[PDB]
Amino acid sequence: EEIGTVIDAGDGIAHVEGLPSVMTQELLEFPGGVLGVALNLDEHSVGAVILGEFEKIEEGQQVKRTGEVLSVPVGDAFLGRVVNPLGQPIDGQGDIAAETRRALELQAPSVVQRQSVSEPLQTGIKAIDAMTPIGRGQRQLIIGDRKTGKTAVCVDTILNQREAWLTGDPKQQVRCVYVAIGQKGTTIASVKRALEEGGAMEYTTIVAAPASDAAGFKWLAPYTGSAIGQHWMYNGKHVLIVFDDLSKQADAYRAISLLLRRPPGREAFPGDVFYLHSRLLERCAKLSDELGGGSMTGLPIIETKANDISAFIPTNVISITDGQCFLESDLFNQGVRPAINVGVSVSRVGGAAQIKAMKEVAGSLRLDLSQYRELEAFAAFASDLDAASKAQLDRGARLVELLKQPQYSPLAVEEQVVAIFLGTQGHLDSVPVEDVQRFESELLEHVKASHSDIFDGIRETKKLSEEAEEKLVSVINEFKKGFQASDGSSVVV
Amino acid sequence: ATLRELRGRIRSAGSIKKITKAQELIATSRIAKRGLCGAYNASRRRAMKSATDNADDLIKALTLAANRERQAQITQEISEIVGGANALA
Amino acid sequence: TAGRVVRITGPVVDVEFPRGSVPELFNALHAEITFGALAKTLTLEVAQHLGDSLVRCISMQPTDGLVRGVEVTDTGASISVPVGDGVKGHVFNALGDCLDDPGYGKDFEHWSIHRKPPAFSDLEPRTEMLETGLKVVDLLTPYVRGGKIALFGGAGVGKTVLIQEMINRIARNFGGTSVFAGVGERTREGNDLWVELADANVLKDTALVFGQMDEPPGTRMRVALSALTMAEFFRDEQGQDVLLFIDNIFRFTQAGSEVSTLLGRMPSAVGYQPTLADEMGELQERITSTRGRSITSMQAVYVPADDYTDPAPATTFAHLDATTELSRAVFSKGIFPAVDPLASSSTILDPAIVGDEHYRVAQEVIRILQRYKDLQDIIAILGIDELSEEDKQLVNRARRIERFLSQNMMAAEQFTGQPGSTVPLKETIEAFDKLTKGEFDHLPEQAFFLIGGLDDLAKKAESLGAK
Amino acid sequence: TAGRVVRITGPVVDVEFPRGSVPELFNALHAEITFGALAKTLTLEVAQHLGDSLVRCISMQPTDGLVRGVEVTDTGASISVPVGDGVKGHVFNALGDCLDDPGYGKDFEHWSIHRKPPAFSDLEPRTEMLETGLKVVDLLTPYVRGGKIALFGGAGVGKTVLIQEMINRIARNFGGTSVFAGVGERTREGNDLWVELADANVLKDTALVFGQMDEPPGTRMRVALSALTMAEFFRDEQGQDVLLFIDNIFRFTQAGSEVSTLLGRMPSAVGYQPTLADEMGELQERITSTRGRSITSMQAVYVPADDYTDPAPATTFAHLDATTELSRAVFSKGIFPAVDPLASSSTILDPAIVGDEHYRVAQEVIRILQRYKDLQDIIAILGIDELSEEDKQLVNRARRIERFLSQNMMAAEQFTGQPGSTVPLKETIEAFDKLTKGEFDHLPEQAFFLIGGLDDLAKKAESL
Numbered sequence A: 001e002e003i004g005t006v007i008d009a010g011d012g013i014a015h016v017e018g019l020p021s022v023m024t025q026e027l028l029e030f031p032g033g034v035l036g037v038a039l040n041l042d043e044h045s046v047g048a049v050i051l052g053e054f055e056k057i058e059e060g061q062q063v064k065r066t067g068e069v070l071s072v073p074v075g076d077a078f079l080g081r082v083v084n085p086l087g088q089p090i091d092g093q094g095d096i097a098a099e100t101r102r103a104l105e106l107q108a109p110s111v112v113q114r115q116s117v118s119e120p121l122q123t124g125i126k127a128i129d130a131m132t133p134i135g136r137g138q139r140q141l142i143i144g145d146r147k148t149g150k151t152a153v154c155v156d157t158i159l160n161q162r163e164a165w166l167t168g169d170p171k172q173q174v175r176c177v178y179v180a181i182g183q184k185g186t187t188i189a190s191v192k193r194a195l196e197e198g199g200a201m202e203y204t205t206i207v208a209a210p211a212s213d214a215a216g217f218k219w220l221a222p223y224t225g226s227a228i229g230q231h232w233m234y235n236g237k238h239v240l241i242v243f244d245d246l247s248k249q250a251d252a253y254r255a256i257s258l259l260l261r262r263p264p265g266r267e268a269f270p271g272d273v274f275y276l277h278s279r280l281l282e283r284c285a286k287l288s289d290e291l292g293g294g295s296m297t298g299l300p301i302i303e304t305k306a307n308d309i310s311a312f313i314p315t316n317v318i319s320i321t322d323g324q325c326f327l328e329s330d331l332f333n334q335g336v337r338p339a340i341n342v343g344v345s346v347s348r349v350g351g352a353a354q355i356k357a358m359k360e361v362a363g364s365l366r367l368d369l370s371q372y373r374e375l376e377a378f379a380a381f382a383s384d385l386d387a388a389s390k391a392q393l394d395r396g397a398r399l400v401e402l403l404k405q406p407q408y409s410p411l412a413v414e415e416q417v418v419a420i421f422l423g424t425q426g427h428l429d430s431v432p433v434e435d436v437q438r439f440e441s442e443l444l445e446h447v448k449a450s451h452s453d454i455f456d457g458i459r460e461t462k463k464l465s466e467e468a469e470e471k472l473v474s475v476i477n478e479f480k481k482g483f484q485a486s487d488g489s490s491v492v493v
Numbered sequence B: 001a002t003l004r005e006l007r008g009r010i011r012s013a014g015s016i017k018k019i020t021k022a023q024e025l026i027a028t029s030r031i032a033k034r035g036l037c038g039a040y041n042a043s044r045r046r047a048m049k050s051a052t053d054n055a056d057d058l059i060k061a062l063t064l065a066a067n068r069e070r071q072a073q074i075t076q077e078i079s080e081i082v083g084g085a086n087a088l089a
Numbered sequence C: 001t002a003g004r005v006v007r008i009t010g011p012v013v014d015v016e017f018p019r020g021s022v023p024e025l026f027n028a029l030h031a032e033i034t035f036g037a038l039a040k041t042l043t044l045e046v047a048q049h050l051g052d053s054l055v056r057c058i059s060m061q062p063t064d065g066l067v068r069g070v071e072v073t074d075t076g077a078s079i080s081v082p083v084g085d086g087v088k089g090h091v092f093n094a095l096g097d098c099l100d101d102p103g104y105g106k107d108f109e110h111w112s113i114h115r116k117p118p119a120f121s122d123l124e125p126r127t128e129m130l131e132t133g134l135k136v137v138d139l140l141t142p143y144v145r146g147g148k149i150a151l152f153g154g155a156g157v158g159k160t161v162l163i164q165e166m167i168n169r170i171a172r173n174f175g176g177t178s179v180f181a182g183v184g185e186r187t188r189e190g191n192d193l194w195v196e197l198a199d200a201n202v203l204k205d206t207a208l209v210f211g212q213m214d215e216p217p218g219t220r221m222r223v224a225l226s227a228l229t230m231a232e233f234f235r236d237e238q239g240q241d242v243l244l245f246i247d248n249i250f251r252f253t254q255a256g257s258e259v260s261t262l263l264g265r266m267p268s269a270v271g272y273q274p275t276l277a278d279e280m281g282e283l284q285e286r287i288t289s290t291r292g293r294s295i296t297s298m299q300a301v302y303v304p305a306d307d308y309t310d311p312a313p314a315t316t317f318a319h320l321d322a323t324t325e326l327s328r329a330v331f332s333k334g335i336f337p338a339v340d341p342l343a344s345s346s347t348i349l350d351p352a353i354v355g356d357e358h359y360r361v362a363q364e365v366i367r368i369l370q371r372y373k374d375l376q377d378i379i380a381i382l383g384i385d386e387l388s389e390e391d392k393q394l395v396n397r398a399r400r401i402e403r404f405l406s407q408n409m410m411a412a413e414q415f416t417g418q419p420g421s422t423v424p425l426k427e428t429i430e431a432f433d434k435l436t437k438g439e440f441d442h443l444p445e446q447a448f449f450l451i452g453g454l455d456d457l458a459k460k461a462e463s464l465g466a467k
Numbered sequence D: 001t002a003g004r005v006v007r008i009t010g011p012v013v014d015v016e017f018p019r020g021s022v023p024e025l026f027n028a029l030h031a032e033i034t035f036g037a038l039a040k041t042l043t044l045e046v047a048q049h050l051g052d053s054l055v056r057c058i059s060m061q062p063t064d065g066l067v068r069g070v071e072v073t074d075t076g077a078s079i080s081v082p083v084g085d086g087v088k089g090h091v092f093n094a095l096g097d098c099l100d101d102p103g104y105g106k107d108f109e110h111w112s113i114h115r116k117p118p119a120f121s122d123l124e125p126r127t128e129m130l131e132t133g134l135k136v137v138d139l140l141t142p143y144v145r146g147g148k149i150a151l152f153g154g155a156g157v158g159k160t161v162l163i164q165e166m167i168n169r170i171a172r173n174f175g176g177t178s179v180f181a182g183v184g185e186r187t188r189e190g191n192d193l194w195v196e197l198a199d200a201n202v203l204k205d206t207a208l209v210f211g212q213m214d215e216p217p218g219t220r221m222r223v224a225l226s227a228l229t230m231a232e233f234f235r236d237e238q239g240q241d242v243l244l245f246i247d248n249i250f251r252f253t254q255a256g257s258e259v260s261t262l263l264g265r266m267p268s269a270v271g272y273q274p275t276l277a278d279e280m281g282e283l284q285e286r287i288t289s290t291r292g293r294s295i296t297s298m299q300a301v302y303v304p305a306d307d308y309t310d311p312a313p314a315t316t317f318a319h320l321d322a323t324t325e326l327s328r329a330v331f332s333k334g335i336f337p338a339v340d341p342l343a344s345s346s347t348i349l350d351p352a353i354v355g356d357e358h359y360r361v362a363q364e365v366i367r368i369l370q371r372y373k374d375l376q377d378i379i380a381i382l383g384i385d386e387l388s389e390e391d392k393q394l395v396n397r398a399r400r401i402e403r404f405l406s407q408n409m410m411a412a413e414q415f416t417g418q419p420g421s422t423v424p425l426k427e428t429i430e431a432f433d434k435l436t437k438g439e440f441d442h443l444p445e446q447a448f449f450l451i452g453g454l455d456d457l458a459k460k461a462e463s464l
């Protein structure tokens, strides 16, 4: 048995002389049930990061090595539970039955162990599902300034997974993991409450690293969530992991590194911060059929400052991920909500992550929106604009009004298909802009009320058939006859 | 502060550019069919084309200045960080 | 079993102890300065264990006059502050010493200023609106009762005046205890607040803890913890609603960064301590309302050089339920309170809590102001006439709206000579709904500047001749 | 004569050796992690000699589970990668290990990845043009044989199809091979490229070398050298005209910066490594034509903050000869390849190299396309009819020219049954000379989509 002695300690770090056989990243037991991680190894001592209650660390204390690298419990029992980066519950609901344990640094699937992303992950947000589709096994960044609706988007996705969960088929169910790094505890409580109101905690786990936690927990929380998701991914299940947000993890890791006297680089970050995030985010894969066919979809969040996407961590994460959703406060204040900037947001997976009906209906949306952005400047001179460009500006305005969405209201894929069908087939041209949204919602209700066969066809076949299209157009015309505008005018013809 | 002011000036110049281009196109249409005329009082299509070109040049210059300031800020920040680290070395 | 001073560099002192007598981290140590003109007792907080039985400590008092090798006594516990109802109505420093009555409270119960935040299980979100009577705050930045409120802004934009206004509008009628924490602010401001509270008979319910900007970094770092400890005692033991005012919270971070390099830490970005977010998180998570126990915390946050991207305010933003960012541009336009309506936010400003009408009016106001901001540069260069008729109408509406968001505050009477005014929430919503519909486009914009409600608007309009 | 680990600080490992057994710089040493969960063999590269028989090394794998004092073996040579015709059709990492078949290539000849560029006398003084057979590339932006070509393109723009087409063309016309270097390759994208190349049968003609984003900086920095060494073997020991794709070169620069920061060097301007230019030149100078054999390179370049004065792109563009930019606009119009003729460029488009007629025709085409792009806004807003008759005829001629710059690529045979075409340079020059003269205005625009030479134009004309 090897026992080390604490030779110094300060602001979360402790140096321990001894333990000549200690491994890098090994967990260490300090008195009083304190836990540390051996990060710096040299001939003189071992610089370890204390995971909590650092004030209890004193010089001369006896430190024992666990003989094991950082590992977390994993199992189905974690669904609906709130745990800390060590897998311990912090919601006061008793112990968690752990199926097994996973090391936090197990290597990601290799190039040969993956398959191309081909399954949609419906976020329930028309803008994302139509313009920047997310497939299962993809890493989609959600990047924007504070108070732009990033957490809203992620929570809406988690809520949207509820119908798939209720189907009961493991090939459709999505297990959700939410990692909160450096967030106010009451904010995590609010997020949990929002998920509970939508019946999402039945299939969601929260890895909580509140702002009061040691920098070690803020540094490890994404990896704990990743391991929990990996345990399900490797067993044939599909997972969706949200990191809120990687910028705070990078800041915590920078604090740890600086306190360890490691050489700083740009923005004082160490030389392996990009390695930190790439290692975290390359574990979200789409496994091959030989490995069960499971997958984990990553939804990292990045909080920029002054909409500066050229900063260090935003640049790294943008490089790493397969696509980006840029949220702008200017659009948010304009009323565009979710405030996704369709001009710059991109999904490199593309149509491969969409069902056939969504791909067909959304094909023209990109062109129409780009053309609308081009024509914006001429809204004051409709007379000067020719007929084509005038109707084109009007169609763009209707479409922009269509992609708006109230919070905590995800849409099923068939409903999104019908809405975008209204938008891109001229069925909103006869409606006032201010009414479009309302019209949309009402029409959808009507289709649910009496014509659910359209939704059933779209859902089961994934294609809007010709006869289904004709029936949808007929229902649209009847609703237009029955629809009442806010200005009191008519929308027929 | 200079970087923020440069970014604000860049967005201002961009808005000026789009409005001037729209005015130029509308003037072209009206020709085919206020004082923004270039030197008629001392034509509006010519003035708006000139204004849009000047806005393009101003935007390019402001972007060059903003990129220079961005690089300078990064370099100075790293200079301070490394100076502190060396002092503590 | 006592240590001795080995090194002295400003507010950081190294102390050597005999083996086995090394003080625990954060323990309070006592040293003596015997110089005639500066005789005193330094209180040193153990910050680091340097090894070889050495400890690095931060001095709460100035170290001028200190001599190497002098006796250092370990108290065995962290800095403690008096707790109980007796603190109400008195002024204390970071160490708990009473200022208005030296030696008072020495017999009360003493609580260590270092504490853990409430368990995640006990935390429960708060969503009740707190009505203040300011048009801009009530409409665009509704405050949460038992929640966390911040007033961001650079130097001299109106953070302290707004804090005094909220003390007048909230603390005066409060049915519970109040704790004010003057963290690294002007001593004149502390005296003014003390006299004002005494005049309004609100001091009897208020406990004041002052650490001024001329004190060493240690006091500025620990005064907030002292005040928060008093507030925590009131919340957890007495079980009564607590009002907690902190001004300025950024001073805590600044003092933390001042000693960072002297403690051996390498500097982070913007010359901040690497543990910026960790210390901020500890302090801010200790400031919170637990299930059944409510703390309404209002903090003035200094934004260095008007730069909201600075790491300090940027880190602080995540710890707040409602934020009012005061802007230098709004301040320089003469609009008071100098709130930036576009940059402000409130977690309860959604239809579920504030109602459909409030949300609709607030969103329309925000949209109009954003469009006006977009058109600012076009107006500046090409002039207003080149905008479309709809754009001109929106510009006039937005100018009137931005003037109407201004108000004459009670705490600002000494600056404008005009008595303050209070506007009920329903009147504010109705007036702004009328404004966004163009009901007042005929009145001059000057009629909307520094007034109260619609009655004041009519009075000012008829004074200017409009109707 | 084996060393032992002394310090471990992330991917930086200090190793002690006996007095007379200190390895040379860049030598590859091997250590072992025995912990069951993370058991592996660490490859370390000697970065510095610290004195007292201590060497600082950069680990090519994560150091988790590594213990102090464990035996460290010295291979006596730097990182060596397999070479030969056997590496074609396989995927390797920066250390030469085959990813699609572990153990493969262990018996091949192994070349050290650190090699000098061709001697001064060996370098060919005369710049030569590479005939790709594509109309747009050959005409407007002729590629330099043994030169460097920047590649720019967004998502869904046909970038990968262009890489595939270039692979097939170099394999067939020039009897060469291809080496792909995924620097900071996304594992998803690497698997996608592997599957696509296998499906299109061009994988047999290319060797893939992936240094992935999940790997530490050292591998992301040495993978480009590994791929370049394979290409150098193909060029030198086998007399083949190699084509070396690098994606992304800026990620090679960033990995170098990260390694420099890890080793403790003070950052230079904008936080890059002090030896940024030296490293970029060392990588790029080995890509040259020598002894009648060339390594032509197409490198995907990322410009931080879209600032071409940034040190990384500024240094990279010092070694770039041509620049091809792919546009979503051109892709939307169905033009393939979706090359932006106005934005793209080439340093060798001067009469001294391409001749008088080539330069004249290229400049006329560029002028027509630029004039039409100027008209585009008026056409979009005020309508086409607003234009004068001369503007109408110029719009029609420019549209025909723009369509004719498209082409049915060979790599497009999979997506459409039409086989690809190879247009000789003289035929392209004369055809575009005729086009700029209006000799094909009577023909419909449809006649100018995805065809080869003038014979194809005529045939498609009668077809319509």
Ligand SMILES: Nc1ncnc2c1ncn2[C@@H]1O[C@H](COP(=O)(O)OP(=O)(O)OP(=O)(O)O)[C@@H](O)[C@H]1O
Pocket: A145, A146, A147, A148, A149, A150, A151, A152, A153, A337, A338, A405, A406, A407, C346, C347, C349, C350
């Ligand atoms: N689609 C939406 N429609 C209306 N309001 C929305 C929408 N999405 C988000 N919001 C509101 O916008 C505000 C910010 O949202 P949210 O906190 O989710 O975003 P964020 O950028 O992650 O924030 P933070 O800075 O707290 O991390 C909240 O009031 C939220 O209710």
Ligand SMILES: Nc1ncnc2c1ncn2[C@@H]1O[C@H](COP(=O)(O)OP(=O)(O)O)[C@@H](O)[C@H]1O
Pocket: C153, C154, C155, C156, C157, C158, C159, C160, C161, C162, C336, C337, C407, C408, C409, C412, C415, C416
């Ligand atoms: N409601 C108001 N009316 C007029 N002037 C004001 C108002 N609020 C603030 N000010 C001005 O703003 C300045 C700064 O006030 P204060 O809040 O004390 O500083 P800080 O904003 O830095 O805390 C004061 O000099 C005062 O004149």
Ligand SMILES: Nc1ncnc2c1ncn2[C@@H]1O[C@H](COP(=O)(O)OP(=O)(O)O)[C@@H](O)[C@H]1O
Pocket: D154, D155, D156, D157, D158, D159, D160, D161, D162, D336, D408, D409, D412, D415, D416
């Ligand atoms: N010659 C062509 N004919 C038809 N489609 C093409 C052609 N070239 C490219 N494309 C289309 O461009 C899209 C993107 O192709 P590719 O470059 O392989 O992937 P990426 O979008 O990742 O660059 C593909 O969907 C493909 O159908």
Ligand SMILES: [Mg+2]
Pocket: A150, A151, A152, A244
């Ligand atoms: Mg958020």
Ligand SMILES: [Mg+2]
Pocket: C159, C160, C161
């Ligand atoms: Mg003040």
